[PDB]
């Protein structure tokens, strides 16, 4: 029993730019094995990242436990990955 | 077009015995021509005044009976 809006990939917005890969792997890997993590390296895409997990239930438990996580002084938000919303800049 | 003549009720033969047994190709067209100058000029020859009681009157005998009853 899972909603169809959830997926294996999760998007993070308003992320700190001084965060390293180890801190992101420790924050994303707390709910399960993370398959991949891509951080933005563009001025138009700064503060956003995409974390794809190996399991769908682990990705849902990670997305349920990352919306509003305590970070450095920004309001980071975790949301589900959408194909029509990620390609809005093109 | 045939669809605009079939949906609006056109191409339907109607006989009006008041105005010399004229032909009408629509019920709404006959209702619009009933309160007109031609139907009033046809009804003025029989002596009936142009009122609202003779709107749906078609035959001359029924209109004469409605004029004599009032």
């Amino acid at each position: 029993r899972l909603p169809p809006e959830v997926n294996r990939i999760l998007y993070i917005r308003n992320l700190p730019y001084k965060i390293t890969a180890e801190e992101m792997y420790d924050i994303f890997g707390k709910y399960g094995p993370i398959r991949q993590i891509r951080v933005g390296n563009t001025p138009e895409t700064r503060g956003t990242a995409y974390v794809v997990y190996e399991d769908i239930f682990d990705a849902k438990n990670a997305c349920d436990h990352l919306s509003g996580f305590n970070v450095c002084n920004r309001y980071l938000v975790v949301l589900y990955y959408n194909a029509n919303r990620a390609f809005q800049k093109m | 077009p045939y669809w605009l003549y079939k949906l609006h009720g056109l191409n339907i033969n109607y006989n009006c015995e008041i105005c010399g047994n004229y032909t009408y190709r629509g019920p709404k067209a006959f209702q619009r021509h009933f309160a007109e100058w031609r139907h009033a000029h046809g009804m003025r020859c029989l002596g009936i005044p142009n009122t609202a009681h003779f709107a749906n009157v078609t035959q001359i005998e029924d209109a004469v009976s409605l004029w004599a009853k009032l």
């Binding site: 029993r1 899972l2 909603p3 169809p4 | -």
Partner: protein
């Protein structure tokens, strides 16, 4: 309720058992589903509140928290003098979301 057109009420003989509401639907009316200007409480039937059905929500059906009451628009339009506003059958509402 007014949102789901397939929801039907009991419309039975209302006794002396007062209706209850859950925490998710606290303050809302039974018919108009409004939370402004309450005027009269809801009277449940004898079959809708018996045994394990006592102290339950009339709209949702879970555990009750507060007392159910109707708004002023239902008391002025004589809508509270009808039968018991208890939702018995649940059709196309909160059923497909649990399986998905």
């Amino acid at each position: 309720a007014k949102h789901h057109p397939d929801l039907i009420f009991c419309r039975k003989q209302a006794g002396v058992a007062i209706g209850r509401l859950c925490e998710k639907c606290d303050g809302k009316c039974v018919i108009c589903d409004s939370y402004v200007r309450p005027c009269t409480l809801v009277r449940i039937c004898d079959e809708c509140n018996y045994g394990s059905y006592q102290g339950r929500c009339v709209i949702c059906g879970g555990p009750g928290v507060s007392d159910a009451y109707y708004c002023k628009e239902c008391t002025i339009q004589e809508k509270d003098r009808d039968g018991c506003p208890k939702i018995v059958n649940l059709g196309s509402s909160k059923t497909d979301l649990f399986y998905e």
